[PDB]
Amino acid sequence: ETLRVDPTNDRLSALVEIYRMMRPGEPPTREAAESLFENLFFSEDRYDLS
Amino acid sequence: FDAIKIALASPDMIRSWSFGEVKKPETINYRTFKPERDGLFCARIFGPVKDYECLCGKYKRLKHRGVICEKCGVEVTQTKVRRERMGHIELASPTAHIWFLKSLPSRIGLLLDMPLRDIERVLYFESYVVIEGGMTNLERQQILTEEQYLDALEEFGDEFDAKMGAEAIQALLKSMDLEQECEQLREELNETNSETKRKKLTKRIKLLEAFVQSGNKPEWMILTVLPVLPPDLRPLVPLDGGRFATSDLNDLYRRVINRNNRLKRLLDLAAPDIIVRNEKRMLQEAVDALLDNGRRGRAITGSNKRPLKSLADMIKGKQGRFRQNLLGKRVDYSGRSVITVGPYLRLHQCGLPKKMALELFKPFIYGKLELRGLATTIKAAKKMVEREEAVVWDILDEVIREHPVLLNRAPTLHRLGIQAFEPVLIEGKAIQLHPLVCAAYNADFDGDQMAVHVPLTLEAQLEARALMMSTNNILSPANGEPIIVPSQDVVLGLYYMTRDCVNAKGEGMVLTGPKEAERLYRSGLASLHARVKVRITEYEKDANGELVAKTSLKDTTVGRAILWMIVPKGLPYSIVNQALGKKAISKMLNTCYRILGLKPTVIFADQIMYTGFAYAARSGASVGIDDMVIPEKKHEIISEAEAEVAEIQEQFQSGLVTAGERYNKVIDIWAAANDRVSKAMMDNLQTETVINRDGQEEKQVSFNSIYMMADSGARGSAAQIRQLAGMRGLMAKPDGSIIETPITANFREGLNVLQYFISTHGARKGLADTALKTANSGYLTRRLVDVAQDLVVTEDDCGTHEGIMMTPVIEGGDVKEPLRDRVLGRVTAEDVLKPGTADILVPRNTLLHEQWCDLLEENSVDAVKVRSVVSCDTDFGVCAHCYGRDLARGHIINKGEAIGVIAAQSIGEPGTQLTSSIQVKNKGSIKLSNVKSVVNSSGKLVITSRNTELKLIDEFGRTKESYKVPYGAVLAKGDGEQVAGGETVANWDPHTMPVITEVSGFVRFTDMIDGQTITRQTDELTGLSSLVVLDSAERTAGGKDLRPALKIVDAQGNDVLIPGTDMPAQYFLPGKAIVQLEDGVQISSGDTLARIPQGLPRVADLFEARRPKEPAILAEISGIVSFGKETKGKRRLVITPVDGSDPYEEMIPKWRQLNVFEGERVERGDVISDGPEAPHDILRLRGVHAVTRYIVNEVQDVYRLQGVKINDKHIEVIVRQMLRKATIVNAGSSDFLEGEQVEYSRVKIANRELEANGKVGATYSRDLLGITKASLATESFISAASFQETTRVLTEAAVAGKRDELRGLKENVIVGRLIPAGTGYAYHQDRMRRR
Amino acid sequence: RTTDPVRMYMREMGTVELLTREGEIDIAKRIEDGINQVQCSVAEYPEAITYLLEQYDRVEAENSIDPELAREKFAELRAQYVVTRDTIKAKGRSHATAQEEILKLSEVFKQFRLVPKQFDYLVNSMRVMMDRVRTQERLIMKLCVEQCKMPKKNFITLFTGNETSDTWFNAAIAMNKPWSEKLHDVSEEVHRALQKLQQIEEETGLTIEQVKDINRRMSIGEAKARRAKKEMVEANLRLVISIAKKYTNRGLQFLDLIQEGNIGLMKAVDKFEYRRGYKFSTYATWWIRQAITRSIADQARTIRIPVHMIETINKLNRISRQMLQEMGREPTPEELAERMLMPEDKIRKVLKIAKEPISMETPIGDDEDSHLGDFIEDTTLELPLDSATTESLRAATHDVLAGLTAREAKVLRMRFGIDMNTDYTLEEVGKQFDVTRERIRQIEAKALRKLRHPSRSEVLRSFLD
């Protein structure tokens, strides 16, 4: 039921589908959306549990 | 001035307002504390800094009053010009007013039929709009992108004209139309026939007719020039720490003028379109953050990382200008101080510190020192005050007498949380409060910071002395019972005074009266407890105020006679001879106020407090460990409870029941053990083995130290004593359940660390309840005080000739309150009479006081006609003889008494303390209503109707017992039979609602196919089954095409009818219709076929009346109610009357319990869905006299369930103000489908349909709005702009031109004049007549 | 589709495409073409000769070139003008060799010595001449299209012909024209405007069509220069958003610094002068940093401290941070004063004016119930003294000086301003009564000797406190 309503399927569009939910109004590129996903989920400078 | 007129700001109006324009972002100089030329604080634009002192120091000291200094433009005048000088920032580009852009509703799209997404597309510089085009493709109000703008540029060229941003929508609003669009929308509103379009086009055309009628323009809605706030109101003042004290609004105005200067530098420098469009977008965002910071985007920060205050954050909630600086304001002559006990004072007398009265009464001290000649000047008297001369204490004692002062608890709970007092001079630094009125404060001595406010002038001084002194009101405004009753300590002393003994060491001595009683108590030879005979002189005014003298011997005690020494002449001894509890002393004070009046009652209360203090000093009422006795059979009850829970655990282990039944059984046996130990401690507490005069053993009321606080109700009910001495009953789990292991031990034995944890669970839950829901009740008081802000007694009596039929609640159980205290103080509408149709003894317009309530109590009255405020015909208030009696005075209510804020303080009073086998309990005759009954073949009477309500009327003629019976019951008794209590008279299964048929005939299965519509399934329980049907969710579309129905007719092929009507005998087949009868058998009338199965947030939801969790819809018109389209889950509902609205349909969401079947007979306004009822349909079908009666029977019983009685008028005038705005149904006077107030609807009936001509169209329909909704629908705007959503309702007032006449009571509070209520009502009688 | 203006500003930045090095020098060459189009089109203007003549008169009293080249190279266009003026005006205006001499005058113009104040004057004079001929055409359109019942299409075909003499006026009174027969009712403005057009044409010495296409070339070159400036500033918004990271303090928002760097880059466009061979980012960095420091000096502070004191207090903050890093202790003003080579009182004076004043909505208490503003003392104080004595002393003087039964009270009430508007000296009260000053002084001393005794003015004596 998640896969019946998915907005985008591709990895790029998908990642972007996020950029619009996080930082709306700015149309991103591939590398910009990838860097935003990395520094928002999988970066030690913005995420630490220790 | 006498009226407040609001409109939209024109740029020429701002240019006239300006008297100086600002163009530079400088505020002041940084070295010298002087603003230079043309700045945000400048002297040319706004005015000078000091009083008559120019900028450079050239013209000062009153020499140049109106000239302008040519060096810097300063006008040498006072500092008062700095609070009224305006702005006029020269904006290079027009900008968007965010109050008219991002509001809810936005009011710029509803003027244009444009969605807010497209408004965000055009105002943010992303998309273009075209005002007019040469072709029909580029029509008006079209939303074009930049690529579409380029395509229209290469396609059209100079034919079209499409700009972007605030200037484009400004020209669009300016050059659309003025009245032709209004006429076209007016004709196209009623040209089309729809409902979704006629709920927004009527609001658009009402907005447009307000624009044309108020003289406003849509060009003035948008902002082309921004005026700044006056600089004294945003003061950049040097604080005493070295740094400066600025406002954040100064920073926002500096940023707005900086972006304006950047725009002005961008226009002449030939900027490209991207930078100037971003500059206009940033100017729009800056003025948006200046007006309302939390609408257009992220809140703008400062240096301290905080959201800065905008012009909307300056007026919003409790932190706004209204509720912090305008409505609730700090005041001079207000002394914060704690409360102490003055027991040696009168009821109108309080204490006052000599230091606080010395500093607080300083103008009175200086005036009395100058008028007596003891002081020469003001500062010599000030030095006499600062050095504490001996004579200033004497002059303070002279000025403090005959000078009342207002004591005030912060925050107040009700109206009696602040009243005046005549202070005396004592030492100390605190206020000695009189102990009798601390219950009216509900302010126990916990160090409560009481403010003491000084009335200055003789108007306010006599208003303090004669109206709001504590000697003026012995009753409460919430109920007729006195809340200034003797409180806990003095009622304990009085209960120790009125107590009797069996030993009674002053036995045998006959007392001459009160004199000898107090003599032999004070001499020590006789005790306070002696059942002897006392000759007491008593008086009663049986004639017109004439007291009669009589003296006889009564079986009483000595202390009752010593209290009778303090009791005045007019009281009887029937109230003094009992045990004299707190409710008995409340009844004593009530009867004293009814008989003697206010003149002896205050002196009686003062003498009662003095005697209670003097005989609680000599009482020695001291709680101890041996006084709080343990019951002797306490350990065996806990041992039997342990054996019972061991039996329950063994029945849970060896499988017979589940864990939920185990929890229910352990809760039941622990409640039984709690009741057993409560009766054990009650039997050990209320009985005490005392010796008689001879050698005997006789029990009596005990002299225990806690039974005086338990039986009399001094401080604590029976549950507190039952949990203190006996074990604790039940606690509160955080999920809402009850702990299965209650506290076995009590407080004297000690609580274990586990048991203290189970206790503190429910204790911290109740404390969080007291922390949250009492503040929620305070905001509910804030809500309810702003919907009844115009109810003042204007006239004395209007010719309405209509009222309510009042009845007490006997809902479910027995009776709770009588009719005497229910219609206490109310005024009758018609000439009510006895239950027999004779001897009319009550006039048309009279109150219900003494010689009227007992005159009905001696009769067997059950329902009387009472005049209300919901039927009062006059506007902007009600009449005196239509409301009844003012509850704190006890006579005819004066013209000016504001009833609505009385009701708000009354409903806000208990907000801090809120936190089947039908067996009759009396004897009477069986009576029903809407009767459809028949005798079956067993000797009983079944019910084949839904709206039957079983009520019991005895031989006297009163409705002592009543019930609510659903459809499908069997009565064991007949109509008019004298029954006895205890026995069950209504027998029906509570788990199912049957389909009992009154057709006595054969059984025929018709119009059903086994397999498509119905199925074949035999019941394996009893073996009695037939062709039955399952639920509607499992069947196929055979029931969706052919309607399944049971036509109970004869077996010979012919058809029968219903006895009484002409409808053929055909019952319908809903879901879960598993019938238990075969065909061909002769069933009788009354046989069963099938089995079909079935608080303060609640107070706030019932006051708002918005929608419950499950709405209970009702039937509209009496007739045949059937189904429309068949059940696709939630399909439809249709209503077909015989002489009513035939094609009108309805909608049923949940098909759980249908009261009436699809095709049977209903009554208009009959219940359809079960559950909580939404009052919108109840007002839409039943009148106001039914909805108001339902509310004063529901929420008053809810308040009574907590243990506090409120008069029903206070939960009646708020309901009257809840339907203030009504919905008109026909055009001709104001509009077709507008929401108009009841005053504007009453002024239209009295103008057209009274003396001018016939009916031009004035019928309407009332609507109960929400409390948050009715506060935004007031005809006055300045009181509506103070409750909540001041942005929204202030924009609605600005775009409509709502000129306030200041008719309501808070509307003169906000403007700062005399209110049109109370003493100011007679001033407004001359104000509104001379205008 | 969003709510933040800076994110859609980034969207508008991402709509346009950036530049490489060859794209940078191509946009610089487009800027050069947009400048040189106006530079060669102004050579055909007759007022440029008088502009260069007044420039030669300005430099007569005067890397850089020698002034002898400025004296020599600013006088040949005068010779070309005085050998063209007998052909462009005299002996007919429509002539081929006259246009050849016009092109000869235009091809000797490249002696620029460009000054930004000099460039504005010719553009302003030609723009107000274009505005004059445009409002001339606008008033002609107002008298001919709206009036006399003829549309706009019946105007341009006779307007483009000559627009010099009276033939176009009676050309609009053509073969029948019954709706346009009102000759003298419309002549009164149009021949008065035609005489103004004729004196404009004799001022410029050229027909109106040639200066019309010259001004059209001015508009075309200005539009091309504006589009080149637009793509130059749009390709370098990454420069301002990458330089705005080092000044992201809590004094201003991001967008104000971005749009100040925008006008700094717009100034750097005309201050670039790309013929040296540098990049636009390197030279634009200094101008955008100057605009950023100007915005952080003028704005970001309630009390507007100027840019030089902002620079000295920024240097003082940097020196204080350096002494914090070198010492660890708090920086005393003595070490900052000796390292700043300034006196210590100036250091404490610029330290006093440290930062923005505490706003009015800071939670100085424990909760959000009482913000600031409920603690400020009143500057316009109204004490019991200042409210009571300021009227009771007035009543006391009105009671005591009423006992003065002669003109001494009447000349003393205006001596200080009691119950009067303007305070007067002895001379102004003299001209009303007693023009010799010492008479008023002696009666004032007599009233002083009457009032200073503690016998009846003791109520006036008690007011000294």
Ligand SMILES: [Mg+2]
């Ligand atoms: Mg308290």
Ligand SMILES: [Zn+2]
């Ligand atoms: Zn000045």
Ligand SMILES: [Zn+2]
């Ligand atoms: Zn009335």
